[PDB]
């Protein structure tokens, strides 16, 4: 299968990208350089990751070296929760553009549906430890995202961590100008997301699967938690196909018509993770992997469960 998926803005998005959350700033420049050298054409970024300057150094060097042309890259970033105010969206986008050393983004996402009080802190707290919300809703933030398209700063806009009712809310927005192109959500064999994926795809919204390997480097990992990479059933499917477990975990969402964004800063794994276009999981393999769902989340935004727009109380 094909390397890119067509978005509802008419542009094509590479189905494999490199994730950068937790990629240390002293390692991510080489990670992105290696990724581009071995074929990656999509990098998933965010201001909250604090490493966009270093990602940008790599992008700029590979453009300067003429390893790739800008039109061949698909660079994604995300608007942090403390910038949901309509007067802050442009500046947030522009800071990301300046750090990534880009004149446009291919895709800019609302990182979470939850808006927080603006300020220096990414998670502003009250004296009791609750995250302080913003009163700006998802629809006014969306209008501000639409303006970025109309100013040439971004080619596509989308959402991330939106539940089905929140997707619907955008789709039903009075005066909607641009539909979301993408909803980026956690998705892997333990969180298969069957209901939300079907909804989004039925509406022409492409889904990107994050944490496809189960984010073994997440900072809140516990010994007892389920581990995709170590799951012998998944290992068995990998062995049958003469591939690694990670390669199965990456190919899985691809065959669901998803985009997938595994993260690594290890050169060998960056290359490994890209060598997924030369085998096929059977339908039986796909059904089997889907059967491992247990509604287990890496990213539950646990500090924000009272926020009015917290996404994960809703079944989907
Ligand atoms: N929109 C959102 O809210 C959101 C949330 C979470 C994630 N994301 C995006 O999705 C990306 C991927 O998710 P993630 O970073 O949570 O986790 P992930 O991609 O599921 O897993 C990354 C971890 O797996 C390791 N790894 C990578 N390839 C491997 C391989 N072939 N064999 C063994 N281990 C391997 C990495 O180690 P090394 O790096 O040490 O090689 C790292 O510890 C993020 O980086 C970010 O770009 C977005
Ligand atoms: N939630 C986050 O995005 C960061 C990630 C991380 N920060 C980072 O650079 N790598 C990481 O895993 C981190 C590391 C920690 F030890 C504790 C919290 C924490 O939170």
Swiss-Prot record:
Known outcome of mutating residue 78 to M: Reduced glyceraldehyde oxidoreductase activity
Example GO BP: epithelial cell maturation
Record: active site: 49
Binding site for NADP(+): 10-19, 211-273
Regulation: Cys-299 may regulate the kinetic and inhibition properties of the enzyme, but does not participate in catalysis. Tolrestat inhibits retinal reduction.
Impact upon substituting residue 111 to N: Reduced glyceraldehyde oxidoreductase activity
Amino acids binding substrate: 111
PROSITE patterns (alphabetical): ALDOKETO_REDUCTASE_1, ALDOKETO_REDUCTASE_2, ALDOKETO_REDUCTASE_3
Expressed in which tissues: Highly expressed in embryonic epithelial cells (EUE) in response to osmotic stress.
Cysteine-cysteine disulfides: none
Reactions catalysed according to its record: an alditol + NADP(+) = an aldose + NADPH + H(+); all-trans-retinol + NADP(+) = all-trans-retinal + NADPH + H(+); 9-cis-retinol + NADP(+) = 9-cis-retinal + NADPH + H(+); 13-cis-retinol + NADP(+) = 13-cis-retinal + NADPH + H(+)
Result when mutating residue 49 to F: Complete loss of glyceraldehyde oxidoreductase activity
Subunit structure: Monomer.
Full protein name: Aldo-keto reductase family 1 member B1
């Amino acid at each position: 299968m094909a390397s890119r998926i067509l978005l509802n803005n008419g542009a094509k998005m590479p189905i494999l990208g490199l994730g950068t959350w937790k990629s240390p700033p002293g390692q991510v420049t080489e990670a992105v350089k290696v990724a581009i050298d071995v074929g990656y054409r999509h990098i998933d970024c965010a201001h909250v990751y604090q490493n966009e300057n270093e990602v940008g150094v790599a992008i700029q060097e590979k453009l300067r070296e003429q390893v790739v042309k800008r039109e061949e890259l698909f660079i994604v970033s995300k608007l942090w929760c403390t910038y949901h105010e309509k007067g802050l969206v442009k500046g947030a986008c522009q800071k990301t553009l300046s750090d990534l050393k880009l004149d446009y983004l291919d895709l800019y996402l609302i990182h979470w549906p939850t808006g927080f009080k603006p300020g220096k802190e990414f998670f502003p707290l009250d004296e009791s430890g609750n995250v302080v919300p913003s009163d700006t809703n998802i629809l006014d933030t969306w209008a501000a995202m639409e303006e970025l398209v109309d100013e040439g700063l971004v080619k596509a806009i989308g959402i991330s961590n939106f539940n089905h009712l929140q997707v619907e809310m955008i789709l039903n927005k009075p005066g909607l100008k641009y539909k979301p192109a993408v909803n980026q959500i956690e998705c892997h064999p333990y969180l298969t997301q069957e209901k939300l994926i079907q909804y989004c795809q039925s509406k022409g919204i492409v889904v990107t699967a994050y944490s496809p390997l189960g984010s073994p480097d997440r900072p809140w990992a516990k010994p007892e938690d389920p581990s995709l990479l170590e799951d012998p059933r998944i290992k068995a499917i990998a062995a049958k196909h003469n591939k690694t477990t990670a390669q199965v975990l990456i190919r899985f969402p691809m065959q669901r018509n998803l985009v997938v964004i595994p993260k690594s800063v290890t050169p060998e794994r960056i290359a490994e993770n890209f060598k997924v276009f030369d085998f096929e999981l059977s339908s039986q393999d796909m059904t089997t992997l889907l059967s491992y769902n247990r509604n287990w989340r890496v990213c539950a935004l646990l500090s924000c469960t009272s926020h009015k727009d917290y996404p994960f109380h809703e079944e989907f």
